[PDB]
């Protein structure tokens, strides 16, 4: 299953369930990073945040943070501050992610 793609729903759900039951997250993170890069190719938000939460990565998180910062610099301001505020504001993932969240809330502050 590490060579064929996975575009289904229930199949991948059962696969992830049996993986988290057997306690093995190597290929889980390998597929999660691919899903995260596929979402970043279309510039997603909520799905990318959910994939980053499920993967507990770092390089892809820094990449999407830099992409969001570049988008904010190009647009002048930020308007999608509520699209990435559904999974956070408590679980400290990383320093740069916490800083991005605190800036997104400082906006409304």
């Amino acid at each position: 299953m590490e060579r064929i793609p996975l575009s289904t729903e229930k199949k991948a759900l059962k696969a992830l369930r049996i993986c988290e039951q057997r306690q093995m997250t190597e290929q889980v993170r390998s597929i999660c990073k691919t899903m995260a890069m596929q979402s970043l190719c279309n510039r997603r938000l909520g799905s990318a945040l959910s994939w980053s939460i499920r993967a507990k990565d770092a390089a892809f998180a820094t990449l999407i943070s830099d992409r969001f910062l570049k988008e904010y610099c190009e647009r002048g301001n930020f308007t999608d501050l509520d699209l990435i505020d559904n999974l956070g504001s408590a679980m400290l993932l990383s320093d740069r992610l916490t800083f991005l969240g605190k800036y997104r809330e400082f906006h409304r502050m």
């Binding site: 998180a61 408590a90 400290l92």
Partner: protein, 91 residues
Amino acid sequence: SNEIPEPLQLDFFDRSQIEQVIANCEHKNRRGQTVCNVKLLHRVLVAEVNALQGMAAIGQRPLLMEEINTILQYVVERNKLLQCLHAKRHA
């Protein structure tokens, strides 16, 4: 001397897992709580929470230290209430 403990904390790991590790490491000697050497248990827990590595988790060191201190205070309160409950029941 019955001090009310605090509920489960630390949203990173699992308090049940920490309790299971403590019960597997330290056995039961003369108290109900599975504990032997407090300093040795603290050092073992510090080594366990430090061996998790972490690239961008450098800022979580004070949080981990305060969590270890909270668990230590909880164990201290448990021992302080057990040493009073056992004596009261014996009397």
